Design a protein around this nucleic acid. Sequence first.
RNA 1: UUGAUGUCACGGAACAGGAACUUGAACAACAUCGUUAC
RNA 2: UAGUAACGAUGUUGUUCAAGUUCCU
Length: 1536
Amino acid sequence: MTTTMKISIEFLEPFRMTKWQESTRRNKNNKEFVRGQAFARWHRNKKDNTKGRPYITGTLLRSAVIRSAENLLTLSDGKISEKTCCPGKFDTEDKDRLLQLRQRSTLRWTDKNPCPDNAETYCPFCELLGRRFRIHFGNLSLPGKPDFDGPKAIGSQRVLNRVDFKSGKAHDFFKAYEVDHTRFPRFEGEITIDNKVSAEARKLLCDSLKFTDRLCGALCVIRFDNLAEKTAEQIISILDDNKKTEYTRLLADAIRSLRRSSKLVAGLPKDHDGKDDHYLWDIGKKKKDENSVTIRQILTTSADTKELKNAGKWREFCEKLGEALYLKSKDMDAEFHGKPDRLEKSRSVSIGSVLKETVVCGELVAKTPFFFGAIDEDAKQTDLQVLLTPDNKYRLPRSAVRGILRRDLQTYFDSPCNAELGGRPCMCKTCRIMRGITVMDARSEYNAPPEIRHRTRINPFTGTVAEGALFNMEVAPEGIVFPFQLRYRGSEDGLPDALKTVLKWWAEGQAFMSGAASTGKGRFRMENAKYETLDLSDENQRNDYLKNWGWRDEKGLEELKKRLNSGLPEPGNYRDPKWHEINVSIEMASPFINGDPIRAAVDKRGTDVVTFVKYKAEGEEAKPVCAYKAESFRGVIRSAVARIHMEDGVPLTELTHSDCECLLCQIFGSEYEAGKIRFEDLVFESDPEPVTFDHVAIDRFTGGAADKKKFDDSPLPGSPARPLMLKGSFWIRRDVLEDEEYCKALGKALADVNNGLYPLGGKSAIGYGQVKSLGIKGDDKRISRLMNPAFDETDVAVPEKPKTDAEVRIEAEKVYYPHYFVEPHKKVEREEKPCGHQKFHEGRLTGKIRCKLITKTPLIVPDTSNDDFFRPADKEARKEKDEYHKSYAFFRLHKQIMIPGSELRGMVSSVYETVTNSCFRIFDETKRLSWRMDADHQNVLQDFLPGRVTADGKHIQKFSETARVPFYDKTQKHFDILDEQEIAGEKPVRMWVKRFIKRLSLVDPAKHPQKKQDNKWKRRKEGIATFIEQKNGSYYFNVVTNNGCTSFHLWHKPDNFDQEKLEGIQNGEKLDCWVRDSRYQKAFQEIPENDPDGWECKEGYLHVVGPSKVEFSDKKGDVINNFQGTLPSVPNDWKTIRTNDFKNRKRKNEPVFCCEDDKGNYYTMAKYCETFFFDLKENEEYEIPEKARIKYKELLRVYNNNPQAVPESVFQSRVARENVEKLKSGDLVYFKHNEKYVEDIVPVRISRTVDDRMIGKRMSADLRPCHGDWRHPKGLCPACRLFGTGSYKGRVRFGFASLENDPEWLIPGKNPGDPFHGGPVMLSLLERPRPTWSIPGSDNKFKVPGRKFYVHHHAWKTIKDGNHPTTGKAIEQSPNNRTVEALAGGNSFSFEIAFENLKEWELGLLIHSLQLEKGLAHKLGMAKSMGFGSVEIDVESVRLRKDWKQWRNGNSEIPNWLGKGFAKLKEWFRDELDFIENLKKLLWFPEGDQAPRVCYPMLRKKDDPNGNSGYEELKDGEFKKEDRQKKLTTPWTPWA
RNA sequence: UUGAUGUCACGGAACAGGAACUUGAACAACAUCGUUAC
RNA sequence: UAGUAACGAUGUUGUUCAAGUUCCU
């Protein structure tokens, strides 16, 4: 007897949904069940398991329909069709049930009786209220009734907020799910309306259903009728296989960066030779086992698998892979909800019968990257994230637009509302409007990943970052466009004034929507405004608005967007928006860098840091542009303000801003209230192409690049020719400009910044940044009036340089050496506390210095961008891979001759650090040394005994003695009769040994004229002689010793005087003879057929190493000559090499083996024997400590890595041929013991000896790098307080030097008329330095000498000629010398030097070190072992800075400073100033008619046209072993 | 998968504070191999 | 019985980032 009507809702906006809960806290007492009553619910079948589906109840729809009906009747005076309606009833006397009352002030129309219940003919409205059910509202659910496995399958729990208004930060919050509508856009249900209801109540229900528009926080229209895990596993396996386990986080952060596109993986960088040996993109590979994969291979093959070809797949893959790697790397409260008041009765009030509706379409675009924080879980790599759509589209939620409209409305009036989440609705002026506003979401259809940014927080006590401040953040692109649609219905005749004013504000570009706005995030600007006002009061109009569901749906919206007139309605009373723009323009004079190492690691240019770059969207694609972060600029200006004002003694950079109204706490804000100034990024107005400068860290001792310390960087170029402008803006609140204290502080700070202090950018310590002029405009001279440069010009020239006093005695016929170490003192002072980079202190100085660099010897400063600068053109450029002769140019920035500031900083820092006897800034505390031990029995080889390590690597069993077995000869066969299991040293062998051979002579006492002078015939006894056979070379004999107990046969060789008794031979003659004993240590397999004498059979271990000790050469040496032609080739394998020739030919002495390869090499190989250790003594083993293992590892490392070794792999020793890395169970060892402990292990008979202590422990314990904790403590070497260190900023900045006049090259160029290019010169070999020649021995008598200052001389005339410095022979090109273009003497450069917080004596010593005495000179440039690079420096104006107004040129105080500095130096050391005497002796310059010849020695004396006793003779006599330390420390000692 | 005579949740901005920065001359001379003789 | 004496040849490149903080109020 009923009829069913089925309905269906289609959402237009992400709806919300509450959380499941068990059926016990489902009462009006749980504050979380309520406050979630107007959302959708989530039922899970099979309770206690999160598996279910969502639904919308029916009571909710009923209440919405009731409310809309109430709204509809009062709109038509209560006449439904013909009859009138009753006023309805909303009172019920019971209040135990009804977990929610009503607090809404229901409407009113045609006041009359409330139609009591005891009746029969109800009012249609009461027929709808339900006075077995007349109307039954059924549940709604999903169409197909599916089942998912949890709420996190369709939604994402996000946090919502509630901010204050005065202290505009926050309050309590609360979180609630929300589900997208592009994946669940339809529900379904039904309504069972009874038969005997009415014919108009059905119409009322139809209209009311068509009038409702929002159900669960979202607009609705109701109608009726598997790889990344294993890839990460494998990559971690690669990284742990090798020891490269510390590049893991960098790999994660760099791989995650590839999600932008899959075409970058084929563009990863390469090594410095174009090879494929990057330092992290090619880990895992090994020389052996080319089946080993590299990371680049993994990334290239997985870049194309037909499933990672779509954008979304590749992006998801990169993201999850990065997260996995990161998580692998890492392990190496007040939510107020509800309080609705349970009110008994609602205050029924009426509102009227007019209702006007206003629709405003249009769109708002972005003008600056925005930010809507939505930090989720299970993604812990970014820690400041944005809000995205399940298909990666940028959205702005409606809650944000609503909150911002509320804030702007409150700002238009001057009254903050104070609603408190409960009770009667508020009635103030700004909530009577916000109760009729409806907005909509947006999607922006951009679909591209967001960029990342890095941030820090600098500690203003040392200058570096604080312990625990470094975080990421991601910002959406700039220029994205969202659609916008706003609607308002009420009683006015259109929009109120407030809304017109606020929309005009947004139409002028001041819609500061949300985000970290303090640093210039989103600032949207509304465009293309339209509007149109409908009229719900009449009847011909309302019916149409009801016929098509208003115009909420898509087609309705499109049909309606053709009926609007353009242009917003201008207000009646404007209000002058409260944010005022200010323009900024900076101009630089140097390079500029803003670090970004991750992009550098991915980029193809192959550098280490690359400047910052941002993107901007154009609808579907981005286009990069170079910029300067806004956080950095804000920080610079803030730290400029904070170091000036005092605020009751302690400067502002020491407070904590707990509750104080500090001047900072009111312009830049704090963590208790918002700020009053907002910045913006700075675009460059140009697109300069970046450059690349190289760097290196010259060690102090043995000046030459330290290990692992080369690098580079890619800053932007800028010079006084092109000054690299910067444009920007920043907004400031209106009621700050009207103040008179704040604008004063801002003006003062910008005055400080414009004067040159506070450099913008990165490595400002070598001349980056250097702001030149900062001019702002747009504030009516309210700030731009404190920034005028005002100073004085009190002129006084600089005091002239003092006269030198250190002299040298230099003559001719003597040659000198170019190193001359400078021994240091023994006391470094470290008991002063550093100052700190806070307020400019009072008793200290701060200013600039300008100098003037003038050269007096050719100078070389190369430009290492490209080689082959001097290439003869009109020929092929180059093959892909070759070893050519590298040619360089001079340094040029924009076709201008300059000198980088780092050079000058290094030079001045070395001089100034050795003046004051300070800690070795950079130094190498590793790399234990090693020397080839000499050949002499009494000295080194007496103590090295044979041995053998046991089966367990803990003991060595010594042998007793040994003798040698000959291989490689022709007089035996030990390679064919022995197995590979004995010649390898594992199986004991039984050989025949002999110790003494015996000679024979016929006449002892008559040989005294010819023989009997060698004094070795002092143990002969007697001998009878026999004869049994005659030969062609010798005579057979038998002899007895004293009485016939021993009898030995042999073959005697006679001479002239022996022939006489031989003439008669009757084979039975008993001649008397004399036998002699000699030494003969040998061991054969069985016996030779020529010596059947007394041999002892022995047993022991045999070992061989192979054919080594080869004297190879390249010039057809002596022994190669006088051969018999047809030199054979190098055999393919040993055990086959036999001796050809003999070195001595008169007798058959030491043999050789001559061969030759295809190239011009000529080999020769002595060592025709191997050794055999026998008599393995038992019950005697020695323990191996770990020092022996370390030393042996080092020895093997030195053996197997040798650039000078023999090219033939067969002539090498066994340690180098097989690449052994550890001592195994049993092998060949010559150990050396002392009281049950071994000390050294050496593989061969004569090998190198390693020292134990690393080089770092051979200095004084106080000259090691003054580093460590040993605010900041006081323990710093005096040179690490002027120049910085790790964890303390320096206080001196150098600058790029520039040349003004004409170049005046060394040798003229190839084309005259163009005097901007020089001619090339060729240089010598210039090999690396050998720290083992100044530390000859290893025991304890040798310490580390000084700092290796090169001397001044004129040896460049020879190189300009073209001959070698030592010899006079010509020098030819090869891939080991360079060809550079150089300058000459007599050019002038000019640079600047800034400082700050200097004492009065630190400046004294610094200005001593900048300009020296009148006869000395500095030294910088390439190849200064020859004569190249000799500069002296003069100091011009020294203008100080007394206060931010004036500058007070201080030329006229230098002698005061110099005296004070020298007085301090004298205070440190009383009369122990020898090192300064030496240092002055070394910087002396040959002034005139003094041409001291210096050069490096040669190897031997027989390869120089002059014969000056090269190195091989200096090793004894003058520089023997003890006089090196002395004859090298003396400043000038002739090399003789 | 609710309950009926009473739901302003379009009733609540995930907001407020933070300098990818500190230190570092693109440079440079003597080593590398083992045994042979008595 | 029971180890002593020290000679011969002249050729050749290397490092290409390291040490720090990596999130909190």
